[PDB]
Amino acid sequence: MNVTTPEVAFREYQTNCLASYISADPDITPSNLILQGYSGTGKTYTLKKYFNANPNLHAVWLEPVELVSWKPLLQAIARTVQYKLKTLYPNIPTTDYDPLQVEEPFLLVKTLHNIFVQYESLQEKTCLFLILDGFDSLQDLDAALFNKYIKLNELLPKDSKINIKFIYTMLETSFLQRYSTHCIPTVMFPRYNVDEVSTILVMSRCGELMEDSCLRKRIIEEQITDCTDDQFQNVAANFIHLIVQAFHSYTGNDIFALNDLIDFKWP
Amino acid sequence: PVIRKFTKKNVARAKKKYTPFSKRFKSIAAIPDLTSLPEFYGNSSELMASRFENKLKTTQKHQIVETIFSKVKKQLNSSYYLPARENEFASIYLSAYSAIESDSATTIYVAGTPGVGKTLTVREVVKELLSSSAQREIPDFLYVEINGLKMVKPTDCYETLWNKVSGERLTWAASMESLEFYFKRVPKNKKKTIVVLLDELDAMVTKSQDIMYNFFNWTTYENAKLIVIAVANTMDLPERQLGNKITSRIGFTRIMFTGYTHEELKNIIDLRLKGLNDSFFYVDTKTGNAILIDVRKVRLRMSADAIEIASRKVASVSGDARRALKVCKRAAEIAEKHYMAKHGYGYDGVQTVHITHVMKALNETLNSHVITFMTRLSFTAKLFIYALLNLMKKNGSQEQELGDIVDEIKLLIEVNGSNKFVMEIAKTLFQQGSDNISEQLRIISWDFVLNQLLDAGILFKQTMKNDRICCVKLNISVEEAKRAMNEDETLRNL
Amino acid sequence: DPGFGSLQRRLLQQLYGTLPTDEKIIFTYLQDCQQEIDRIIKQSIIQKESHSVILVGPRQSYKTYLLDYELSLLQQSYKEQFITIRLNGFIHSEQTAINGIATQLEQQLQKIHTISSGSLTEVFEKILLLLDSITKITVVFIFDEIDTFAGPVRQTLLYNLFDMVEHSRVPVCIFGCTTKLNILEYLEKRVKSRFSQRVIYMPQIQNLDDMVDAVRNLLTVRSEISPWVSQWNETLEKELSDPRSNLNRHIRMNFETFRSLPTLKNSIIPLVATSKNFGSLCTAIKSCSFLDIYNKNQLSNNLTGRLQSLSDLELAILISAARVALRAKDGSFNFNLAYAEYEKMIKAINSRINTIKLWLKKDVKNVWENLVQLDFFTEKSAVGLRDNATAAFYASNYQFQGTMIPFDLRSYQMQIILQELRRIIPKSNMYYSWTQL
Amino acid sequence: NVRMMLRRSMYKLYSAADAEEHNDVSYDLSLVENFKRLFGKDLAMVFNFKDVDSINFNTLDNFIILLKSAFKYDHVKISLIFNINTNLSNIEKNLRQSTIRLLKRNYHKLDVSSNKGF
Ligand SMILES: Nc1ncnc2c1ncn2[C@@H]1O[C@H](COP(=O)(O)OP(=O)(O)OP(=O)(O)O)[C@@H](O)[C@H]1O
Ligand SMILES: Nc1ncnc2c1ncn2[C@@H]1O[C@H](COP(=O)(O)OP(=O)(O)OP(=O)(O)O)[C@@H](O)[C@H]1O
Ligand SMILES: Nc1ncnc2c1ncn2[C@@H]1O[C@H](COP(=O)(O)OP(=O)(O)OP(=O)(O)O)[C@@H](O)[C@H]1O
Ligand SMILES: [Mg+2]
Ligand SMILES: [Mg+2]
Numbered sequence A: 001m002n003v004t005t006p007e008v009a010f011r012e013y014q015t016n017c018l019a020s021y022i023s024a025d026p027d028i029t030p031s032n033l034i035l036q037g038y039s040g041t042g043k044t045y046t047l048k049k050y051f052n053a054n055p056n057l058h059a060v061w062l063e064p065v066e067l068v069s070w071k072p073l074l075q076a077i078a079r080t081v082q083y084k085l086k087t088l089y090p091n092i093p094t095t096d097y098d099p100l101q102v103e104e105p106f107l108l109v110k111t112l113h114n115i116f117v118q119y120e121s122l123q124e125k126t127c128l129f130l131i132l133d134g135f136d137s138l139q140d141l142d143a144a145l146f147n148k149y150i151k152l153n154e155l156l157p158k159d160s161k162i163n164i165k166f167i168y169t170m171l172e173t174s175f176l177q178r179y180s181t182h183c184i185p186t187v188m189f190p191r192y193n194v195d196e197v198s199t200i201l202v203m204s205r206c207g208e209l210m211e212d213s214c215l216r217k218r219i220i221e222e223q224i225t226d227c228t229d230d231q232f233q234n235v236a237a238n239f240i241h242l243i244v245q246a247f248h249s250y251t252g253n254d255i256f257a258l259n260d261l262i263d264f265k266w267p
Numbered sequence B: 001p002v003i004r005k006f007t008k009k010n011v012a013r014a015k016k017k018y019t020p021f022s023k024r025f026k027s028i029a030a031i032p033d034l035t036s037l038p039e040f041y042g043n044s045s046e047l048m049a050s051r052f053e054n055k056l057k058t059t060q061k062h063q064i065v066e067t068i069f070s071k072v073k074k075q076l077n078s079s080y081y082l083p084a085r086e087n088e089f090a091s092i093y094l095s096a097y098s099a100i101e102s103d104s105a106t107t108i109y110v111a112g113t114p115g116v117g118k119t120l121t122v123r124e125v126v127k128e129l130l131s132s133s134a135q136r137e138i139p140d141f142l143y144v145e146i147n148g149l150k151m152v153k154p155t156d157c158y159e160t161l162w163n164k165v166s167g168e169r170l171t172w173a174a175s176m177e178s179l180e181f182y183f184k185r186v187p188k189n190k191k192k193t194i195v196v197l198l199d200e201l202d203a204m205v206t207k208s209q210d211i212m213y214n215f216f217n218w219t220t221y222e223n224a225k226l227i228v229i230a231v232a233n234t235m236d237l238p239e240r241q242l243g244n245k246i247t248s249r250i251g252f253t254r255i256m257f258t259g260y261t262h263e264e265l266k267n268i269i270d271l272r273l274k275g276l277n278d279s280f281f282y283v284d285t286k287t288g289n290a291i292l293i294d295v296r297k298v299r300l301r302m303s304a305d306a307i308e309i310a311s312r313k314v315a316s317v318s319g320d321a322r323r324a325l326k327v328c329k330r331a332a333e334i335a336e337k338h339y340m341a342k343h344g345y346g347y348d349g350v351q352t353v354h355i356t357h358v359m360k361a362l363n364e365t366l367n368s369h370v371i372t373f374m375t376r377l378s379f380t381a382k383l384f385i386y387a388l389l390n391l392m393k394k395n396g397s398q399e400q401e402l403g404d405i406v407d408e409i410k411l412l413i414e415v416n417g418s419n420k421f422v423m424e425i426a427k428t429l430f431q432q433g434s435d436n437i438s439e440q441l442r443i444i445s446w447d448f449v450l451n452q453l454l455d456a457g458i459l460f461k462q463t464m465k466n467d468r469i470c471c472v473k474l475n476i477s478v479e480e481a482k483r484a485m486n487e488d489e490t491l492r493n494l
Numbered sequence C: 001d002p003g004f005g006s007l008q009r010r011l012l013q014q015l016y017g018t019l020p021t022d023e024k025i026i027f028t029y030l031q032d033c034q035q036e037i038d039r040i041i042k043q044s045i046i047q048k049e050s051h052s053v054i055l056v057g058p059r060q061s062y063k064t065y066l067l068d069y070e071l072s073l074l075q076q077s078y079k080e081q082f083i084t085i086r087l088n089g090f091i092h093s094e095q096t097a098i099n100g101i102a103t104q105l106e107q108q109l110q111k112i113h114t115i116s117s118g119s120l121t122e123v124f125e126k127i128l129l130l131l132d133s134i135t136k137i138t139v140v141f142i143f144d145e146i147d148t149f150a151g152p153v154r155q156t157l158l159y160n161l162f163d164m165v166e167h168s169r170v171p172v173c174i175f176g177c178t179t180k181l182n183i184l185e186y187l188e189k190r191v192k193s194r195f196s197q198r199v200i201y202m203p204q205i206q207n208l209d210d211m212v213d214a215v216r217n218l219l220t221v222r223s224e225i226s227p228w229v230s231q232w233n234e235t236l237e238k239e240l241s242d243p244r245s246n247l248n249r250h251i252r253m254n255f256e257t258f259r260s261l262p263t264l265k266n267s268i269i270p271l272v273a274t275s276k277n278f279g280s281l282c283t284a285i286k287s288c289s290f291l292d293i294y295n296k297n298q299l300s301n302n303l304t305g306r307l308q309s310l311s312d313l314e315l316a317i318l319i320s321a322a323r324v325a326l327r328a329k330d331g332s333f334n335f336n337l338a339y340a341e342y343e344k345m346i347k348a349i350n351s352r353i354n355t356i357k358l359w360l361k362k363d364v365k366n367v368w369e370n371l372v373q374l375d376f377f378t379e380k381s382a383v384g385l386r387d388n389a390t391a392a393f394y395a396s397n398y399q400f401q402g403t404m405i406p407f408d409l410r411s412y413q414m415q416i417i418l419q420e421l422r423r424i425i426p427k428s429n430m431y432y433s434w435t436q437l
Numbered sequence D: 001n002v003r004m005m006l007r008r009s010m011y012k013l014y015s016a017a018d019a020e021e022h023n024d025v026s027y028d029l030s031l032v033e034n035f036k037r038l039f040g041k042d043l044a045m046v047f048n049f050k051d052v053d054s055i056n057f058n059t060l061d062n063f064i065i066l067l068k069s070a071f072k073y074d075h076v077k078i079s080l081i082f083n084i085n086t087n088l089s090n091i092e093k094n095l096r097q098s099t100i101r102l103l104k105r106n107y108h109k110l111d112v113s114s115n116k117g118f
């Protein structure tokens, strides 16, 4: 299946991996797959950066960073599923069920079975993609969990015109390592290095703080008419060389707190 | 405008009533007879006994195959006379007969291991008592099956009791109370004798036995008549859960059923086979269908001495008939399928089974797969458990950390920079042969095999977060660990 | 050609196991079991036995896949005779399962020719009386992880299923997949009475050549499609015959490292999954140099490369923690303690003699937590992540001393010991002199 | 804990903004970013940590990390206040500086007592 590659700077390994893993036909996609990583790497940035590379594939998005537990995931899921369905099949009829009707994965399964037996009459089969960003990062998390979400292609009947797929994102690797016996595909992102985080920042925050006000302030607080944006980027650049040549020692290969301290001490 | 603070919509409220029967006559003179009643005493469950018969019916038939042994398997299955356990019959049937002659409130407790014919023998005692109801000389009375294990909430006893004595629907906190109202407040001349039997009380009353307390509190009247029984495995229960004053004041009768003797075992299992024992069949030439008194007429038989050894081995442990009977069936299975494998018919003049294969069926139950498995693993787990035993040899600790065992491991290796097997598994485990690959403190696959054994059950990991100081324990033995250890040619010498 | 692309897809779904029920592949090293259990199922499909049985094998060993396969074979001549039931004990409970039973029981009965209504006990007794009390249709359950139903006290449903097996007239087929070995041990008496106790295990690999011919089979074509099918077969066979192939050496690796296939398939997929033209396929599977990239980036960031990318400040303080934990009894350590030994190290370094700068307590305040969040330290009487609900619940009820006491004096703990790091590091460092107590 | 005080917040918000305009949604952060497409109006919140000092700073940290997860809908604003009793430098290094960086951005400061200036 023709997949446009995102010609990225720094993750063309994982690009290869997942653009190979996944295409429109579900058969050449796995049943359940992880994309573990670490913060700042833009794992979440690059997933949608790939969906840019492939529009005709669609996915749902959840962020249980804000949710707390299991039932709220159930409810949000039962919402977004049929929401997405009917929003993207407008002509289709429905009897839209209450998403708050769910209070347990069985009930989610039951109502999805109802979704499907009402969506029975499709022309071709379809698998979609679910997204749970920070499923490690929950706040009353216990260890009896991930196996269950693996087992969703388990109890679904095989005659589904509409199927789904799961997507994850973790950090530590400890509780990952707790469970890899299930022989799972997985793709990963090493914590960057200094030229790497450098170039990520000179390509990412360049346009931001090149197009923040305090430039346009200072240029005319000083009132000096000898200027060009080459040199604007240039002075920003060497300024950031100074930033990082200072505080690489302070942090290493991160971006977030660097952005914070930039915003504060830039002016 | 208002908002409910939390919703319940997947509720399934049950349409069952809170008004007991005590408040639909409103006087002692105001009451009719339940015996002169169509809805009481269960004249309506039969329809829901037959309403669901047709749901699963078909008539598909294509090239039926039928063979020798299966008819004997089903001669031998538990779903059907017995003279083996007959003095308890002659005693409890005597007691119940004299009881319904007395019209008293008598109580009885029995226990016994699963596989004692307790449910069998009792269900047959009361079938004989059904035929005694078919005498039409004893007062008619009614059975009550109680499978609390086929019930969810153990107060539903009262509910189902009322919905089967009346067919009327309430909650327990109306039903049992209306039932006490039904029991003591009601005289005899129209209230009926009912017989009831409780099954496996060990899990039913787990909290405080207030349910069964209520029950045994109902069992102590002189104006009310009932026939009560129960089943368990332990014996101290009536005095354990109650205490002594209650169980003593009631003054019931206690018994338990035991393991049967090997002779009775063989007697009975053959008693379920005499219709087919030593029989001769007309037998077709293609399908081998064994049809009874292009066709043979051959004989069938089974090893009697094998009956002897098979009953003999398991009569001494428990006396579980079911175990004996499955051993029989599985021996028949291996015989039949080896026979089929001889000719190789496909799928679309003597035949006898042996002591050899009877015992082949009886033995693999006790022959554990774990040993051949743990021997047939990779090298790594064997190596690691061997290191564990090395530590157990070095300290006699009965327990080890992760860091200590990993130190033992590295030492157990780097000592043996001389053995060949460890010479040849050398470089292909940390960075795997080639360059471009930096080293790693631990080996590959150690986390894998760790979890592998954890799932296996041999390994026990306490709850901590540190990778190093987490305490670790092995579950089985060190001897058997050596019965895996030296079986490797390379391990026995190191 | 896209004939080859379709062939990629062909061999890919052959790699999965996602084929029609004539090309689905099974091997002689498990045909003893395959030909066992097709027979064990059709005895209750068509010959109407009520056999009870429990499989045993570990994860990723193709148990449920094979129930699926044999029944999928069965479908093509038997569209009618049976009813499928899949389940799971983590997914379900002792309570929400029975409602799924009613649901499926009601909503596939429709596919050929009420139940789900009522309370818990009501729909319970509805299913009871339907099952307890010309031809009957056969029934097959597929439990998964009965371990959940292997609890201590009640687990009544299992007793009731097996009483249904014995007592009933319908063929009650029961399969159990799990991961533990001693399963019979868990049980109370009545289960050991009602259950057959006949329980089956799986085979292991007993030699390399088994895995070799398995690779051959799963990379062998059984249909003429593309201009490189015979090429594929002959290439496979001639490379796989060689014991000197890299890929045979990885076969050895699974034979010794893991001894289990599905991880291997996972590793094998990306090889084709990236494969774009044919000369690339050839040279790449010849050298297997990209297995190198694979397995370098596979477990790359577990323990080592993570310490390979950090500042020197982290190293100094980690040393200040290491040597003093060595000095200590439990190896416990705190913030300012490490700060003290750190500055001592620097005093020594600057006393033996471009220059050096040390990092104020504010400068350590930040990165100490970058340290605690990268799994190198922990807390003394620590407990990491609870397993089940009520523990996760009580956790957010009762807080910790460490939660209440301030940042810098809660009793920490360590992951690595000094001499490990001593051997581990590049010893060329300016600090390598300082890596020894 | 975190989740409870979140439920308090959402209960207050929905039972406040409903009756002022005249179906149920659960108590979660989805609701706030879903405020537009139930009632139509935009919203601006203000948070008063009443006794700022006597509380679990961990639970606090968790909460505020949760609360920063909703600045991506371009239709809402909020504001926080700390009603302090001791001092900033007493506690601005008691809590993790992760929280505190952005809290360097846009702040305000008052001297606050009964006896202001005689
Ligand atoms: N390959 C890349 N090309 C360009 N920019 C990148 C790349 N990787 C990361 N970035 C930058 O780093 C930022 C990190 O964003 P993001 O929050 O997605 O990281 P993350 O690791 O996903 O964080 P989280 O732990 O919250 O998931 C991105 O928004 C992006 O600006
Ligand atoms: N004397 C006998 N005659 C015929 N069959 C027997 C005899 N003794 C045992 N059996 C067989 O063994 C089984 C024993 O059943 P039993 O009444 O002991 O069940 P149970 O112990 O009540 O079960 P549980 O303990 O699980 O409630 C019967 O199903 C029957 O087929
Ligand atoms: N529908 C399917 N299509 C293709 N391959 C499958 C399918 N289902 C399972 N498999 C293969 O079978 C393996 C898992 O099978 P199975 O679940 O029987 O193993 P297991 O050890 O029983 O795992 P578990 O005990 O968790 O069920 C995987 O390697 C997978 O590739
Ligand atoms: Mg992200
Ligand atoms: Mg019984």
Ligand SMILES: [Mg+2]
Pocket (backbone or CB within 6 Å): C062, C063, C064, C065, C177, C178
């Ligand atoms: Mg399985």
